[PDB]
């Protein structure tokens, strides 16, 4: 689980 | 003598893992004669060494401003761990000591809505995509808006406005030309919070 | 140092509404104990006025002084751009403090009212979000508001102005109310005053 913003990344569980 | 000042990092540095976060310990009217500053760093109270002072810079009421700042770890900020500063120098009695944190309290998680454009908007050349973030805390928050996988232009995101259950909200306001709304184009609202599952969340609007 | 000005303007919707009392309001602090009294002379366009309100001192218990005169305004004044001075009069000053504000400058806009519903996915809790999208005003003094069947609705929050990309205003409103009323396709009314409106007020309703 990872979450993208723009290509950029946030976080992952 | 010299005064103190502790400042937190910004939102999106602790939310996005592939950034940097860091506290900055902000020192104002250090004088040209004892211009020597010593900085103490602790979290929860145990000292860590890997602090880097940045490039001292005189004022024109000719003091300097010295500075420290420390690299953070992101889940240690939002455990909500202690940072304290402490800073020594001979104009001063004693050292000062300032003390940062995140905010207090137990997050609450932005419900995230999208609204369409007014019917009676469709008369001018553009249109409003709203997106309308609230019941979060704390009030850290980023919002943007994008359109296949880029960034949108035309936005405006209000600050966040404390309601009275001890929560926040905001709105964000995208402008986009009628024609892109009405030949079906899909806009999305992308949010950053601490309270969100990986710290996002992303919700659509299209005709 | 010396006594600090600081000259406040009236209240946007007092400033609109008739039935209410726009002040403009002049403040000066760090005044001494050594050097207290305090003079103010007002003006309106150039030309002095004599009806001010001038309040005793108050005592700030952190060496200082603070004292406050107000000037009452005629609202056509305050929507016609008419400037206000105060000048302040001291001891401890070399020469006295003026200070002049006036309704913001610059050609009014009217004000694009927008009542939206709430989103389908607000349909899960016990209370849904009514918004008032208010937009391209100029300058941003307004005042907006909420009613249904002739009843105030008092449970709502306005972000302030926002300055918009075209040198305009704009700003949101958030009515938050029981889903059962929204369901029942009651009728609610956002209520918005502003100078570049007719009759300077309007009324958008919102309903299912
Ligand atoms: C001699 O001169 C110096 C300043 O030099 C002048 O600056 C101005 C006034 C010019 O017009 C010129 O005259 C000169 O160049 C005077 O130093 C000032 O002293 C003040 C105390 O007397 C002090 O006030 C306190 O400021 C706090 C906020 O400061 C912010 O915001 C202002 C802008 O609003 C900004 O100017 C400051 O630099 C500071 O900015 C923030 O810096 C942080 C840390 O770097 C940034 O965040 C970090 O940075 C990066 C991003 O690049 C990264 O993301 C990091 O991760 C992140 O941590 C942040 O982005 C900056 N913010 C902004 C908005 O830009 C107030 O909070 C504080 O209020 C509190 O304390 C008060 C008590 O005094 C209380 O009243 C109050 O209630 C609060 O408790 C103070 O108001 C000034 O900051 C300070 N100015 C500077 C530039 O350092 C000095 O006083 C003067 N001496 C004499 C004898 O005259
Ligand atoms: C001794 O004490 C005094 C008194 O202060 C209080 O008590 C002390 C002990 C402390 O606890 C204080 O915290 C207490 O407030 C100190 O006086 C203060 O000095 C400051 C300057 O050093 C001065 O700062 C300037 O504030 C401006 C905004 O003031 C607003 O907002 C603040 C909150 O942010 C609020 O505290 C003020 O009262 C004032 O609030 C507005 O007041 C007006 C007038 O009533 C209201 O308008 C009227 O409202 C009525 C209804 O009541 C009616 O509707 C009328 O129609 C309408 O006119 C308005 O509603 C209020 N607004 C709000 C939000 O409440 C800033 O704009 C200004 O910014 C400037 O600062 C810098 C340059 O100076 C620049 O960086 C910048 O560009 C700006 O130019 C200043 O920060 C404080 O206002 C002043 N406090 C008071 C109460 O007068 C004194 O300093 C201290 N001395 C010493 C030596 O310690």
């Known amino acids: ?13 | 003598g010299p005064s103190v000042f502790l400042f937190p990092p910004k939102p999106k540095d602790t939310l996005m893992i592939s950034r940097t976060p860091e506290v900055t310990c902000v020192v104002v009217d250090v004088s040209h004669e004892d211009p020597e500053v010593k900085f103490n760093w602790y979290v929860d109270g145990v000292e860590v060494h890997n602090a880097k002072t940045k490039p001292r810079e005189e004022q024109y009421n000719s003091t300097y401003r010295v500075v420290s700042v420390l690299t953070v770890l992101h889940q240690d900020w939002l455990n909500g761990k202690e940072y304290k500063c402490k800073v020594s120098n001979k104009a001063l009695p004693a050292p000062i000591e300032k003390t940062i944190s995140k905010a207090k309290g137990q997050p609450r998680e932005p419900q995230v809505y999208t609204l369409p454009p007014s019917r009676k908007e469709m008369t001018k050349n553009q249109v409003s995509l709203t997106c309308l973030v609230k019941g979060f805390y704390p009030s850290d928050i980023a919002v943007e808006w994008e359109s296949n996988g880029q960034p949108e232009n035309n936005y405006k995101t209000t600050p966040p406005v404390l309601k009275s259950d001890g929560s926040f909200f905001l709105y964000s306001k995208l402008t986009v030309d009628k024609s892109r709304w009405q030949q079906g184009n899909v806009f999305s609202c992308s949010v950053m919070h601490e309270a969100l599952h990986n710290h996002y969340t992303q919700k659509s609007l299209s005709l």
Not at chain 1, 1 to 13: F, K, P, Q, R, Y
């Open chain 1, 1 to 13: 689980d990872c979450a993208w913003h723009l290509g950029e990344l946030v976080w992952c569980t």
